[PDB]
Design a protein around this nucleic acid. Structure first.
Ligand SMILES: NC[C@@H]1O[C@H](O[C@H]2[C@@H](O)[C@H](O[C@@H]3[C@@H](O)[C@H](N)C[C@H](N)[C@H]3O[C@H]3O[C@H](CO)[C@@H](O)[C@H](O)[C@H]3N)O[C@@H]2CO)[C@H](N)[C@@H](O)[C@@H]1O
Ligand SMILES: NC[C@@H]1O[C@H](O[C@H]2[C@@H](O)[C@H](O[C@@H]3[C@@H](O)[C@H](N)C[C@H](N)[C@H]3O[C@H]3O[C@H](CO)[C@@H](O)[C@H](O)[C@H]3N)O[C@@H]2CO)[C@H](N)[C@@H](O)[C@@H]1O
Ligand SMILES: [Mg+2]
Ligand SMILES: [Mg+2]
Ligand SMILES: [Mg+2]
Ligand SMILES: [Mg+2]
Ligand SMILES: [Mg+2]
Ligand SMILES: [Mg+2]
Ligand SMILES: [Mg+2]
Ligand SMILES: [Mg+2]
Ligand SMILES: [Mg+2]
Ligand SMILES: [Mg+2]
Ligand SMILES: [Mg+2]
Ligand SMILES: [Mg+2]
Ligand SMILES: [Mg+2]
Ligand SMILES: [Mg+2]
Ligand SMILES: [Mg+2]
Ligand SMILES: [Mg+2]
Ligand SMILES: [Mg+2]
Ligand SMILES: [Mg+2]
Ligand SMILES: [Mg+2]
Ligand SMILES: [Mg+2]
Ligand SMILES: [Mg+2]
Ligand SMILES: [Mg+2]
Ligand SMILES: [Mg+2]
Ligand SMILES: [Mg+2]
Ligand SMILES: [Mg+2]
Ligand SMILES: [Mg+2]
Ligand SMILES: [Mg+2]
Ligand SMILES: [Mg+2]
Ligand SMILES: [Mg+2]
Ligand SMILES: [Mg+2]
Ligand SMILES: [Mg+2]
Ligand SMILES: [Mg+2]
Ligand SMILES: [Mg+2]
Ligand SMILES: [Mg+2]
Ligand SMILES: [Mg+2]
Ligand SMILES: [Mg+2]
Ligand SMILES: [Mg+2]
Ligand SMILES: [Mg+2]
Ligand SMILES: [Mg+2]
Ligand SMILES: [Mg+2]
Ligand SMILES: [Mg+2]
Ligand SMILES: [Mg+2]
Ligand SMILES: [Mg+2]
Ligand SMILES: [Mg+2]
Ligand SMILES: [Mg+2]
Ligand SMILES: [Mg+2]
Ligand SMILES: [Mg+2]
Ligand SMILES: [Mg+2]
Ligand SMILES: [Mg+2]
Ligand SMILES: [Mg+2]
Ligand SMILES: [Mg+2]
Ligand SMILES: [Mg+2]
Ligand SMILES: [Mg+2]
Ligand SMILES: [Mg+2]
Ligand SMILES: [Mg+2]
Ligand SMILES: [Mg+2]
Ligand SMILES: [Mg+2]
Ligand SMILES: [Mg+2]
Ligand SMILES: [Mg+2]
Ligand SMILES: [Mg+2]
Ligand SMILES: [Mg+2]
Ligand SMILES: [Mg+2]
Ligand SMILES: [Mg+2]
Ligand SMILES: [Mg+2]
Ligand SMILES: [Mg+2]
Ligand SMILES: [Mg+2]
Ligand SMILES: [Mg+2]
Ligand SMILES: [Mg+2]
Ligand SMILES: [Mg+2]
Ligand SMILES: [Mg+2]
Ligand SMILES: [Mg+2]
Ligand SMILES: [Mg+2]
Ligand SMILES: [Mg+2]
Ligand SMILES: [Mg+2]
Ligand SMILES: [Mg+2]
Ligand SMILES: [Mg+2]
Ligand SMILES: [Mg+2]
Ligand SMILES: [Mg+2]
Ligand SMILES: [Mg+2]
Ligand SMILES: [Mg+2]
Ligand SMILES: [Mg+2]
Ligand SMILES: [Mg+2]
Ligand SMILES: [Mg+2]
Ligand SMILES: [Mg+2]
Ligand SMILES: [Mg+2]
Ligand SMILES: [Mg+2]
Ligand SMILES: [Mg+2]
Ligand SMILES: [Mg+2]
Ligand SMILES: [Mg+2]
Ligand SMILES: [Mg+2]
Ligand SMILES: [Mg+2]
Ligand SMILES: [Mg+2]
Ligand SMILES: [Mg+2]
Ligand SMILES: [Mg+2]
Lengths: 76, 183
RNA sequence: GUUUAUUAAAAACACAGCACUGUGCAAACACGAAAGUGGACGUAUACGGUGUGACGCCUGCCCGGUGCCGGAAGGUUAAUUGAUGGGGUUAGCGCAAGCGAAGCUCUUGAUCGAAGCCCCGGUAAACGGCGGCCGUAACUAUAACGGUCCUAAGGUAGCGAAAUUCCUUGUCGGGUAAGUUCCGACCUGCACGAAUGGCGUAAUGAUGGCCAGGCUGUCUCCACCCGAGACUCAGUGAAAUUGAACUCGCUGUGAAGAUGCAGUGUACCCGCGGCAAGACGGAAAGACCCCGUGAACCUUUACUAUAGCUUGACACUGAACAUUGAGCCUUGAUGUGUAGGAUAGGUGGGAGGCUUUGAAGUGUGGACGCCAGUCUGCAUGGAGCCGACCUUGAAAUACCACCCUUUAAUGUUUGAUGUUCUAACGUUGACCCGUAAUCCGGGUUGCGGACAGUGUCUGGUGGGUAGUUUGACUGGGGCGGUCUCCUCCUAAAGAGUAACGGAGGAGCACGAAGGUUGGCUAAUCCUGGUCGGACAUCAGGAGGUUAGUGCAAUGGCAUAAGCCAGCUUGACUGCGAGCGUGACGGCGCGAGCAGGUGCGAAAGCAGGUCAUAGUGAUCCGGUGGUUCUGAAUGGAAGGGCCAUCGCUCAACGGAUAAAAGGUACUCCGGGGAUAACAGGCUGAUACCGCCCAAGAGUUCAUAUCGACGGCGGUGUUUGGCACCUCGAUGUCGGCUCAUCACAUCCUGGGGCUGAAGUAGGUCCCAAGGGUAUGGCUGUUCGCCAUUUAAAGUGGUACGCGAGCUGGGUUUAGAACGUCGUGAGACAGUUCGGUCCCUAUCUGCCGUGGGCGCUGGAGAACUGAGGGGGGCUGCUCCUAGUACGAGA
RNA sequence: CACAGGUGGUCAGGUAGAGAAUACCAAGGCGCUUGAGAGAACUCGGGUGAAGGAACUAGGCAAAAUGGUGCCGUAACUUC
RNA sequence: UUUUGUAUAAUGGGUCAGCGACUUAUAUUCUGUAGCAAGGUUAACCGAAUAGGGGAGCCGAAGGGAAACCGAGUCUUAACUGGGCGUUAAGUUGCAGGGUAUAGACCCGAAACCCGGUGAUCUAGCCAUGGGCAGGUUGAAGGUUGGGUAACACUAACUGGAGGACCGAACCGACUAAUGUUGAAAAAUUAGCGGAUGACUUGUGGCUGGGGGUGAAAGGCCAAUCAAACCGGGAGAUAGCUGGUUCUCCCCGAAAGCUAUUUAGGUAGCGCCUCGUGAAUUCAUCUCCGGGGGUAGAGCACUGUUUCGGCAAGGGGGUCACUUACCAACCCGAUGCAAACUGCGAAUACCGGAGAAUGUUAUCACGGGAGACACACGGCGGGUGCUAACGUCCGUCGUGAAGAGGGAAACAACCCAGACCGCCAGCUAAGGUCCCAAAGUCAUGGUUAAGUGGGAAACGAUGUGGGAAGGCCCAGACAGCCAGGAUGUUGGCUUAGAAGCAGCCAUCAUUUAAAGAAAGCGUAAUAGCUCACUGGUCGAGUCGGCCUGCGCGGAAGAUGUAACGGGGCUAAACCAUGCACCGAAGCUGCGGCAGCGACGCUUAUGCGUUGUUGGGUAGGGGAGCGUUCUGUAAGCCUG
């Protein structure tokens, strides 16, 4: 039976939110699935983390027919 | 673990008592007690099997005992089956009800007979006491093979006691009224 | 007999007696780095060691384990010897690249090598051990009997509820009015048992248990008397203790048990004699318990050393002959797979050597030999057996090479054993002188003799000795369990978030299961369909990702991340804008840049795997590369820089390369941070009461009861908690003295009764008083005997040790069972085992002094108020009446 | 400590006595370096105790009790 | 003192006086200060000596790299679009202070470890050499004699005098009980007690020495001490523990957390405090703007759990694959439940952009000094537990801690509120206003009659208020009184009897105003008998559900009323409204001190007005007092 163990916290989540500043390369969201997806200039990594490929403002949104969430970067 | 020998100890015990009850059933007190005949070897016309499969073992009074039957061509056939069977009962062929009387507690019966039940009681205890011995031998054993905690032993060595103790209470209190059937 | 001087005198130790074992005398053994000494001025009828413990009847089976006593064939091995190869250097050959002579040197470690161990054998009055299960007898029960498994092997004699028995106060018997003890049985021996002796035994015993007469103030139940204190007078004159005191009760409050707080009640001031309920009174930094990377001694197959014991080598250490364990070996042999003109070398040369420079095979003088066979010293033999033969995975002792198996002798050569010798060395034989000397030296002589012994080196042995280690978390500790890593929930819609909280998984896998290009799309149901079922595959429809993801969980995933194929190595090297997450060490994501690949027509994609586990610092050292370093210089060695290797260091930030335990013989530093007593919190549990009413009650739910369920009260059981106390709050029972509650045992007053009477039942009211002696056990308790009107239930530190007791219970002694290799251990049992304190305060029982009460004094009172007392049987008349069939 | 403790050897009177026990005495030596009174509880040490006689208690703890000589006389058991 | 917390019945102190604990040396770093400055400074030594010499040397002006080397660059790499570390920052030597390293390193303190000595005048054992044992018993071997024998065996006296033998003083011992327990005594006294010819006892001297002895063995004894003697040493062993730590005033002011730890009552980094240096509107509140949420709640499509119905494979049973009373998945409809369900989904919270006010920079960075890593209660959200605990484990806030004052009787942790100092002045908070006891026996409208208030539940009751509706009723209701209450008919009835009748079955069927084949008393069965129902009588109300306030039973504990703090209250309780007042260290008013700013007078800034701040434990920072001693001092005070 014997319970009483667990992993470390892996400190996931959103790291920079809507319309934050953020320079290229910065991480926007850690996640396990692609709960969010990669929008414009935001390349998803092998983590599934979404960073940014351009200085700019973060933008959450939801396009398409599966109605899924995309993180864009509005150019700046 | 302890579980399946706590319940094992238990069945062995309260089925230990239900032999005592069963062997202070083959004695003859003053009282009628139809379960006296209702455990008697008897032949009839093909095969053994008790008289259960034939007659009603009823009563007429504390000191007598009617045998209501169906079929009246085996009245002597059983009469001998009953009147030679280590009891000492001469059945009257008054017809219809094989009258088996209950001769009184002759005092050399209120005693010496009594001595038998409270001896038969004692050996029933001993059997229980020995279920005890075993039950926690298993316990003690599966301890020195580190599968129990001292505490878990101790709480299992008692409680086995609780099983013995209660099980004796049944033996002792089933004997105790059975003693009233003479005292 | 002896012993814990100073809590244990015993059953403990000793004992005579028994046995095992070691010792040939320079004894074993002991004290002594040694000399020497004891043993003993003794000599196996002796001396040492170990266990047993007069005597009697006796002392069984087990050698597997651990020991000890024997062994040798090998296997494994020390110092040593230093074969053999590798490397450094550099005379010289070199266009230079390299090469590399001797020597010196760093390696490697052939060969030799004793005991030990491995192994084989013995030994239990060595340590020690002496089983399970399944069945079986005309009814039951049991099992003389059978089966099976497991052992070294499975408890014989005797004994057994015991110094041993848990359940246990076992059962039966005796003894008693009554017997948890005692005695006699039984055997169901938790867990007796044969010299860590078994079972008996007259005598002994300040030894353990039980009984009986006598005796008694031990006790019903105390009385009186004589003395020493106590009390008063005079003289002398202490003590512990002490923050400060103007030092009451009660109920609450409060760091949780109040002289000191709140409320209230009572109380003129001060002594003397008395009592010990309280000041968590005095005394001693609690012994129990826990904590300290504390201490000691102690044990041991803990670790590491070590004296001792033991093996060999070298030295002291010489002269002679012989034997043989042997690595190997020229003269040369050693030899039937299945089908043989046969006891067939791995497989080959290959076309006359021996004859003429002495040879068949028919005897077998030597003989191997599995008594199945044969080479053929010397010749007998007196000019050719015969071979690629037609069989054979392959053709000839037809000639000859080193020889996988086996076997045999030079030279000598690895080294082991023996004898002889005398001159080293020993002499704890005799004699001689120093010398009127059992020491010493010298001398003579006999014995021994290169041995013994000693020194250096070396293997083993080594609790004899010594130093240490033996983790933590923990609802005290221990026991269990846990210790890193990943996923979900607890987690309160960012992150994070704890418990010995609820659940699971990881310590890997894959050269494709990685890369890219191209392609593809599940589960489930319904219907049809050979074997074919709920489900194998096929068909179609519904379905729409419920499937699938190498694997836990969660997040993902159709543009699939799921499934197939072709081509492939981006499971690339250097770097890295900028972020994530960590106290840190670190860990993670990343576009882009350089170079160089793969895939695609191309756009592009690829720095491993849908993602999140799959792991180990630093030191130390190995390997490969690299002139970076180079102790005068040249080189080298070693060091550095890159790449990489060695760890369940899992107690997973890893104290050491290297480690278990006992302490009741104990110790110290600490803690009410932390258990045990008592208090406090709680009230699950307990106990007491109530709500519903199927049902019992012949009929009738509630006279008396009450199933399935339900609600409370108390603080009162079992518990939970760890607030108080560890610079000390003495624990059970007894005694004495108590005091309160009422949930009333008796007595008193009532209701209902399934109350005729008598006597019961149940309920209400009532706390005035009263409420047993004994047997048994330390017991409270309880059962038992016998009374009584009754033998009430609780609280009071489970009332009451500065009041007594000390039987229980926890110190040190001892022993049995059981556990352990042992030290020791038991919430098992047995025998023994120091109980201090002169009363300041409070309180209390008594008894005086002072003052007040209004001028003082003598009496007698009134009685506000306080206390004491408050129990109950029997007989009788009423009356043998009411009632009753009677009793 | 002018401490009811410890300390080896010598001597051995009278009466009773088995005696070096014990009581009284001799020889010799002493009354123990606070007295005086009182005549309560309670403690200490002691005397006697009606009836009962272990009912006490863990337990006959303590006390009470037996006690000399001579002669008769004495069971199981026994290693005699 | 220690603690979450102490009047605490937890530590310590009988009182006084005197002494008694953060130092010294050397390095090292920071700060303050002084000199000199891309320089600074010397050490030993010399010295004619605090001078002056002496520049050996140290620090610094250059770094990067492992190094060779290169150099304001270097390293990395083939090279970097680049990256790491440097160049843009003055240093150094004294003096004073804050830390740290080595030292005993604030002070006191273990149990112990090692070295060397002194101890067998106590005691254990042994070795020489001398003593001691009154008195009384028993009567071994041996001898003699006699009996006995065929001879022996055998037996009897007498003699003899054995024994870890018997009783018992001295002597040796120590089993029991009392006493004594600040003793007469640091182990005894008194009454009993074991040994007392022996493995006895004792005098003198001797020998054995500390991991050693000795031990008829207890870990016993070795000088009142022994699981390792005493004395001196190493030695101020070590003490992550306990205790203690001494003058005054000012400013700030924590923590009981995370992470790691042979770690848990210790320590380290981080967090929090203090001080310094420096830096941007840094930071916070609110506003609007840009965000992600999957919690509360709800829902049941998914995952699972669940009840009814419909539908149904199959499962369970009757056949000789069929029917089926029965448990039945899926689908459908109705209905619930979930921390590890979600097709929904808040309030808050958090992030970010902007902006104004306010805020003594509240912010970040760096540096000097720390402290702390035992928490506690309360509110809210939870795991645990029993939605038990003054329980335990997290989150979040508040308070205590480290905060006084008023309130809650008393009551760290609740309510109110943050105490610089003086006031015989004022307003308030919470809580109060009959007396104790400051303020209403205040005003108005209700309720309760239980001392409810001022303790307790299921459940029970014509208590007593308020509200909206009902049924019945002068064609006479509700109660009460008068009457009738009959007949199928015993009802058939397994009926021994029931005919209402424990039972039996139905309950339909006559009659009149009305009467059940039956409500109970109830009989052996009848049944005597009241009911229901109805006629009369009387004469105006009566019946019982719903919503609702307050009250009643249910309600028993232990020292003493003791369950409002008390008296006492019928309002002095309760509900509603109003207005007064009392109440604190809060706010205000005077007067004063200090830190920080601002304006005006004015400089080393005094200052006037003014703004503001001034609880405090660990702890940081600042400024003083006084003691002894040196100079000033052959000065000054002083018979
Ligand atoms: N029997 C051999 C002996 O060798 C001796 O010589 C010794 C040395 O001289 C000789 O060393 C030589 C060296 O000199 C010469 N230059 C090179 C040779 N390889 C070395 O040989 C040595 O070194 C090699 C490793 O390199 C090792 O295997 C081993 O030590 C030895 N063989 O090796 C011998 C010892 O190892 C004498 N010549 C003599 O006593 C006798 O011959
Ligand atoms: N000692 C006297 C004897 O004890 C005997 O006791 C024996 C029995 O109780 C019992 O015997 C059983 C046997 O009955 C049963 N049916 C089969 C079982 N294998 C036997 O077992 C016996 O024998 C075998 C050897 O064959 C052993 O392995 C085992 O240890 C032993 N217990 O084992 C005991 C022997 O160890 C019997 N009571 C009887 O023969 C006699 O009284
Ligand atoms: Mg004796
Ligand atoms: Mg003693
Ligand atoms: Mg001997
Ligand atoms: Mg013995
Ligand atoms: Mg034996
Ligand atoms: Mg017995
Ligand atoms: Mg034994
Ligand atoms: Mg014995
Ligand atoms: Mg006096
Ligand atoms: Mg109190
Ligand atoms: Mg009080
Ligand atoms: Mg007094
Ligand atoms: Mg202590
Ligand atoms: Mg040791
Ligand atoms: Mg621990
Ligand atoms: Mg969260
Ligand atoms: Mg895959
Ligand atoms: Mg593709
Ligand atoms: Mg199908
Ligand atoms: Mg060189
Ligand atoms: Mg050199
Ligand atoms: Mg002991
Ligand atoms: Mg001991
Ligand atoms: Mg201690
Ligand atoms: Mg506590
Ligand atoms: Mg207490
Ligand atoms: Mg706690
Ligand atoms: Mg706590
Ligand atoms: Mg005390
Ligand atoms: Mg009552
Ligand atoms: Mg009742
Ligand atoms: Mg008694
Ligand atoms: Mg009794
Ligand atoms: Mg008796
Ligand atoms: Mg008590
Ligand atoms: Mg006492
Ligand atoms: Mg005792
Ligand atoms: Mg007294
Ligand atoms: Mg005197
Ligand atoms: Mg004296
Ligand atoms: Mg005398
Ligand atoms: Mg005197
Ligand atoms: Mg007197
Ligand atoms: Mg007397
Ligand atoms: Mg008397
Ligand atoms: Mg008398
Ligand atoms: Mg008598
Ligand atoms: Mg008694
Ligand atoms: Mg006595
Ligand atoms: Mg006497
Ligand atoms: Mg405390
Ligand atoms: Mg504190
Ligand atoms: Mg207080
Ligand atoms: Mg006090
Ligand atoms: Mg105090
Ligand atoms: Mg105290
Ligand atoms: Mg004190
Ligand atoms: Mg002596
Ligand atoms: Mg004697
Ligand atoms: Mg004697
Ligand atoms: Mg004694
Ligand atoms: Mg005496
Ligand atoms: Mg002594
Ligand atoms: Mg020691
Ligand atoms: Mg010290
Ligand atoms: Mg030292
Ligand atoms: Mg750790
Ligand atoms: Mg919800
Ligand atoms: Mg259904
Ligand atoms: Mg949140
Ligand atoms: Mg904002
Ligand atoms: Mg600042
Ligand atoms: Mg620090
Ligand atoms: Mg800590
Ligand atoms: Mg903590
Ligand atoms: Mg906390
Ligand atoms: Mg809570
Ligand atoms: Mg207050
Ligand atoms: Mg209160
Ligand atoms: Mg107050
Ligand atoms: Mg108000
Ligand atoms: Mg007032
Ligand atoms: Mg009024
Ligand atoms: Mg009340
Ligand atoms: Mg009417
Ligand atoms: Mg009520
Ligand atoms: Mg009001
Ligand atoms: Mg006012
Ligand atoms: Mg005021
Ligand atoms: Mg103020
Ligand atoms: Mg002012
Ligand atoms: Mg202030
Ligand atoms: Mg402040
Ligand atoms: Mg302050």
């Amino acid at each position: 039976t014997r319970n009483g163990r667990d992993s470390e916290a892996k400190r996931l989540g959103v790291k920079r939110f809507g319309g934050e500043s953020v320079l290229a390369g910065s991480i926007i969201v850690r996640q396990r699935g692609t709960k969010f997806h990669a929008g414009a200039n935001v390349g998803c990594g092998r983590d599934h983390t979404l960073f940014a490929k351009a200085d700019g403002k973060v933008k959450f949104e939801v396009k398409g027919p599966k109605n899924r969430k995309f993180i864009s970067i509005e150019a700046e | 673990m302890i579980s399946d020998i706590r319940k094992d100890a238990e069945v062995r015990m309260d089925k230990c008592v239900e032999a005592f009850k069963t062997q202070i059933s083959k004695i003859r007190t003053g009282r009628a007690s139809p379960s006296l005949l209702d455990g008697i070897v008897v032949e009839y016309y093909g095969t053994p099997t008790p008289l259960r499969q034939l007659a009603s073992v009823t009563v007429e009074d504390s000191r007598t005992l009617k045998i209501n039957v169906f079929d009246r061509s085996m009245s002597p056939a059983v009469e001998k089956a009953i009147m030679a069977s280590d009891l000492g009962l001469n059945p009257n062929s008054a017809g219809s009800d094989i009258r088996v009387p209950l001769p009184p507690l002759t005092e050399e019966r209120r005693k010496d007979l009594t001595k038998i039940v409270r001896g038969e009681a004692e050996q029933a205890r001993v059997a229980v006491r020995n279920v005890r011995r075993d039950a926690n031998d298993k316990v003690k054993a599966l301890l020195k093979d580190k599968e129990i905690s001292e505490d878990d032993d101790r709480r299992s060595q008692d409680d086995v006691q609780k099983l013995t103790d209660a099980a004796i209470k049944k033996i002792e209190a089933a004997l105790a009224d059975k003693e009233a059937e003479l005292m």
